[PDB]
Amino acid sequence: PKHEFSVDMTCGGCAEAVSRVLNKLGGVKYDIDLPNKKVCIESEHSMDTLLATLKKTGKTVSYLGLE
Amino acid sequence: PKHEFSVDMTCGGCAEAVSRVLNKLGGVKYDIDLPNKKVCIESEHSMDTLLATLKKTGKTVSYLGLE
Ligand SMILES: [Zn+2]
């Protein structure tokens, strides 16, 4: 499935941090849109797991839905 | 014990995210210095707990020392 998240990133270092935690999770194909504060993740991992992984960063995260 | 870490923060959002993962751990008093990319932490938590907590940001972290 393909999920979209809102993630409050401000600089390219913020985007790098999201990339690093998602790399560490594994089993994801992701695309980070820094100026629109959006992260799109294609994964077999549950929405819960993706959301928990993103919130681990200490950034503000919410769910923009499927597809 | 007062621990000192290097954390590669490059914007104020990077710094706030550090403060939220530390708030989540709890039992910490801290100072985050953005231009010098340093986080000082007074805590009874072990060095390894603090290090692991900071690494959840997805940022590059290293240990500077202890007082
Ligand atoms: Zn940043």
Residue numbers in the entry:
A (entry chain B), B (entry chain A): 2 to 68
Reported in the publication:
Atox1 is a cytosolic small protein (68 amino acids) able to chelate Cu by a conserved surface-exposed Cys-X-X-Cys (CXXC) motif. Once bound to Atox1, Cu is delivered to cytoplasmic metal-binding domains of ATP7A and ATP7B (also called Menkes and Wilson disease proteins, respectively), two homologous multi-domain P1B-type ATPases located in the trans-Golgi network, for incorporation into Cu-dependent enzymes.
For the first time, crystals of Zn-bound human Cu-chaperone Atox1 have been obtained and the structure solved by X-ray diffraction to a resolution of 1.9 Å. The crystals exhibit P65 symmetry and two protein molecules per asymmetric unit (hereinafter named chains A and B). The two chains are equally folded and arranged in a two-fold axis passing through the cage of the metal binding motif, similar to what was found in the previously solved dimeric structures. A positive Fo-Fc electron density signal was found between the two protein chains near the Cys12 and Cys15 residues, supporting the presence of a metal ion. Fortunately, it is possible to confirm the identity and location of a metal ion within a protein by collecting X-ray diffraction data at photon energies close to the metal absorption edge. In our case, a peak in the anomalous scattering density map close to the cysteine residues of the CXXC motifs was found at 9690 eV, an energy right above the Zn K-edge (9640 eV), while no anomalous signal was found close to the Cu K-edge (8970 eV), as shown in Figure 3c. Therefore, it is possible to conclude that the electron density found in between the CXXC metal binding motifs of the two chains belongs to a Zn ion. Zn binds to the sulfur atoms of Cys12 and Cys15 of the two chains in a tetrahedral arrangement, similarly to the Atox1 homodimers formed with other metal ions. The Zn ion presents a crystallographic occupancy of 0.69 and is surrounded by four cysteine residues (Cys12 and Cys15 of chains A and B). The sulfur atoms of the cysteines around the cage are at 2.3–2.4 Å from the metal center and arranged in a tetrahedral geometry, with bond angles ranging from 105° to 118°, as expected for a regular tetrahedral coordination environment. Moreover, although the affinity of Atox1 for Zn2+ is lower than that of EDTA, soaking of the Zn-loaded Atox1 crystals with 2 mM EDTA for 10 min resulted in only limited removal of the metal ion from the coordination cage.
